[PDB]
Subunit: 131 residues, 2 copies
């Protein structure tokens, strides 16, 4: 995830942390893990970095049930949706043109100019049910 400004070891470290993992996580959890592995990087610094990255769109954002935003560096850059298990945090890249066509059709029927759909599916793995 290249940054608009000059690259610095803190930005490189947070980028390495983002690409290191695949689950969704907020600023606090990534701050914890980067400090524990030996980065010593600021909370507001990582917050600003992920704000800039989300503005660039290199990462993907998701508001949890409480409300806090979690972020995942997704491999696929095209339009896509994520199936997320809260017990595991794993994200599966799922994309469907049917929902996009439905959104376009309902927007056209209602005469709406632009459509910005938020579609999230929350579930549990089969292993989660098993003990």
């Amino acid at each position: 995830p290249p940054v608009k400004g000059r690259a610095t070891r803190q930005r490189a470290a947070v980028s390495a942390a983002l690409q290191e993992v695949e689950e969704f996580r907020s600023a606090q959890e990534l701050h914890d893990m980067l400090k524990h592995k030996g980065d010593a990087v600021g909370l507001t610094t990582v917050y600003r970095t992920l704000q800039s990255l989300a503005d660039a769109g290199e990462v993907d954002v998701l508001r949890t049930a409480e409300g806090e935003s979690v972020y995942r560096r997704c491999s696929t850059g095209d339009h896509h949706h994520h199936l997320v298990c809260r017990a595991c945090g794993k994200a599966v890249e799922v994309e469907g043109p049917a929902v996009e066509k439905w959104a376009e059709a309902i927007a056209a029927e209602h005469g709406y100019v632009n459509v910005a759909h938020t579609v999230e599916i929350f579930g549990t793995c089969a292993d989660c049910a098993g003990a």
Copy 2:
């Protein structure tokens, strides 16, 4: 909108005020509107009664983009999704089988035991463009 608690003027007043308005609105906005109407009802009371109603399923919740929560009453008791114009705040309920079929297919393919899909979509309506 019956409330699980005992009959009291607070619950009746907040339920009637919610019924009068047909727009997604936050707790503070509802509190201010009720104060202006002369209810003289508490804000913590609004929050508690609104959470009780949401748990009862008689009301429809939604999370704002910035983080706050808005709530609205829809006449239909059946499951439905919402198109909400951020500029005006007006919300309209629709239902399309395609999202349900896609969710079922994804759950079957990935083996997820149970899933909970949230589909709330946003777009500007015609009157926004009109001047």
